[model samples]
Target: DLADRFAELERRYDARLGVYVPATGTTAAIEYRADERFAFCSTFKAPLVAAVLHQNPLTHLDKLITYTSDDIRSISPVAQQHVQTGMTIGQLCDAAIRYSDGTAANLLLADLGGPGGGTAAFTGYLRSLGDTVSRLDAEAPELNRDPPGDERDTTTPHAIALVLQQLVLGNALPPDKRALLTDWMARNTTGAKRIRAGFPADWKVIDKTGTGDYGRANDIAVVWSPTGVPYVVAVMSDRAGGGYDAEPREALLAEAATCVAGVLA
Candidate 1:
C-alpha cells in the first residue's frame, strides 16, 4: 500500500523516489525502491567524518585546516569567509553536515589526504562496512553533479540508511565520536522542509540532506518518535529531467515522510 502510494506520488511529481524505514518493535521494515540509487551529494560528508572517527577521535577538535581562496566553491557560507585562516576539523564537520558546506567538505577531504587518499579511503571504509552500493568518486561540488543515469557518487536509500543503523547507531565508533555525528545530525539546520516537516514539532529528528542535478532533493535520517524510540528513514527524490533548482519543490519529500509517520507505531 505504501509502495503504491509512493509510485503515485512519483508519477504525479515527475520524480523518482526511494524510501526505507527500518523495523521497529511494532512495525515491519518498509521498502519502496529503497535499493535504487540516488545521487549521494553532500550527504556523504557525514560518513566521511564518521570514517575518520572509526579510525580514532581527533586529537583536538580545534586543529585548523588552512586553505587558499582557490579552494572555495559555491554555497560555502561557512567555509568561504574563513578560507585564509581555515576552519577546524570540528567546524568543517558542522559546516559540512549542518550547512551542507561544499568548501568545508573539500577542506576535510584535503585533510584526509585528498581524492587519492582521503576520499578513496572513505570509499574503502564503506566497503569495510560491507557496502557495495555506496561510492565516493570525486570531491565535493564536483561530486554533487547528480547527472541523470550516472552513478558516480550515489547510494541506495537502504544502503545509506543502514550506515546509520549499523555503524552510527551501532558501535562502529566510540560513544563520544558517534554522538559527535548524531548531535550535529539531530540539529541539522537544513531540511526543515524535507523529512522533518512531516512530524509534529515535538518529535526529534537526526537528518542529513543533499541537493543538485536531476533536481536531487534527498534526506536520510533517524526519526525519534514521541515515545523516544528511533525510526530510521531515508527518503530520496529526483526529477525526470536533468534540471537544477536552488530551491526545489520539497513538498514531495515532506509528503513521503508523512506517509512514513503514518505507518510508524
Candidate 2:
C-alpha cells in the first residue's frame, strides 16, 4: 500500500525520496529507499546539540560566546546582524536549531573542539549509535551549498530518523535534554513551508530541515497525529535542478505523512 503511494509521488515529482516508519512493538512499517544517503546539510545540528548535551548540562550552555566579523556568513541573518556582539551558548543553539543558522552552528562546532576535534567528536557520536552511512566534516560557516564533488556531510533518511527516534524513544539522552531538543524543533521557524506545510491543525510535528546543492530538500520529524499517534517520518528529496523553494518536495512529505497516518491510526 505504502509503496504504491510512494511510487506515485516519486513519479509525479520526478524526484527520489526515502522514507521509514518503524512499526510499534512487533509490527512492520513502511520503508522505501530509506538507506540511501543524500547530502544531509544542516540537519546535522540536531545531533550536534545532542552530543554537546551528552557531556555538558543544560545550564552549561549559558556560557557566553562572542560573534565577531569572522563569524558573519551569508547563510545566517542572525550572525550577520549580531556581529561584534555576545550570546550565550544556549542562544546560539536556539539560532542553530530554530532557524538553521550556519554561523551559530559553526560557533558551536568551534566550541566542540574547533574544526578537527569537532569532526572527530561528531563522527564518534554517529559511530556509537551504530550508524555507518553518515559522516560530517568540521567546516567553518558551514554553508548549505556543497562544493563540487564533496559529499562529506551526508546521511540516509533512515539514519536521520533513527537519531530522532533515539532521542524521542531510544533513551539516548536523559528525559530533560530530550524534551529540550524536542521543544526547540517544534518551535523551529525555517521549515514552516516544508514538512509541516500540509499538516492537520491538531497534528504536532517536531522536525529538522536540510537543504543543499542541486535542489536537495530534506526533513526528518516526529509527528503526533490528531488521534495522538506518534510516529517518526524522514523524507529526503534529490530532485534535479530543484532549488530551496522545492514546493513539490514539501508536498510529497506531507502526502507521505498523511498516507502513514491513515494506516497507523
Candidate 3:
C-alpha cells in the first residue's frame, strides 16, 4: 500500500512525513510515527496568522496590522524587504504565507503579545479544533529573539496534518473565510517540486515550503485535483541547504504525496 511505501521513504531518508486526505469533510491520514515532533520552522505561520484574525476580524480586511523594527530582527535567512510601515494585514499575511517572511510573521507575533500570548493563543486555537500535537515557545524570551545557530522550531507531522485537513474541509475558518484562505494558500510561492510533481500540469495545488541552513528541507501543501479530490500533505525534513541540487529531494517528496493522495481518492 502507499502508506507502506511512504514509511519506507521516511526510513531511508531519515525524514518525517504527515499526510491527510479530506473529502466530503472527512480526514484520512498516514503518519510515519505517532509521536514524532520537530521544529515547524516557518510552517507555523498558517495557524498563527489565522488565530490573529480570529482575535481581530479587521485583519481580514485592508487595515495596517503594524510592524516595528524589532519585529524584523528575527534570525532567519528568509528576509523581508519592505518595512511594512503602513501595509494592510491582508498584504502582510500574503508576505508571511507566500514569501515565508520571518520578519513579517514576527510583527504579527508582537501584535498577539509575543510568544506567550501569540504562540500560546495559536496552540489553544488548534486544540479547540481537536488537534493537540503542538506547543509554542512564543513566550520564551530566547525563542522570541532572532533565529540562532541550528536552533530548530519543533512540531509534529500529525499536528500539522490536522491543520491542513481542516483547511481543506472549510472547518478551519468560516465558509467565506475558508475561500479566502484557500485562495492565498493556493498561491504560496515556495517548494514547487514535491506536491506539484505528482499531479497534472493543470491541476491546482496550494503549497508552503519550510527550509533553511538547518536540515529542515520540507514542503507542505493541499492539492486540489482535476478529478475532484483534495488532500492535505505535510513533508517535513532536515537537509543541507544545497541550492538547486535539493530539487530532487523536494520532487521525491511531492511524488510520494500525490501517489498517496491518488490512491485514497
Better candidate number, 1 or 3, judged by lDDT: 1
Candidate 1 has its poorest 10 consecutive residues by lDDT at 240-249
Report the lDDT tens digits of candidate 1 across residue range 117-179: 377888888888778889888886677775666888889889888887765578877888888
1-265 per-residue lDDT for model 2 (tens digits): 7799888988888777788777665447678888876777788888887877776878978898886776676477676666666878888788888888888888777777744747777877878877777888645444455542356777887887887788776788899988878888889887776667646668898888877656667887888878776788778876654554444356766776667666765
lDDT (tens digit, per residue) of candidate 3 on 1-265: 8678877766666555554443344554555543466556677777766766666675345776655566555543333455545566777677777877776676666666645646666667778777766766653223322232223345666677667677656566776667766676778877577667766676677877665433455566776667766666677654333332332256446767667656655
In order, candidate lDDTs are: 0.81, 0.75, 0.62
Report the number of the highest-TM-score candidate.
1
Q: Tell me the lDDT of candidate 3.
A: 0.62
lDDT for model 1: 0.81
- Two-way lDDT contest, 1 vs 2, winner: 1
Kindly indicate the candidate among 1 and 3 with the higher TM-score: 1
Between candidates 2 and 3, the one scoring higher on lDDT is 2
Q: Please tell me which model should have the higher TM-score, number 2 or number 3.
A: 2
Q: What is the total number of backbone clashes in candidate 2?
A: 1
Estimated TM-score for each candidate: 0.94, 0.88, 0.77
Candidate 1 regions with alpha-carbon error over 4 angstroms: 114-117, 242-247
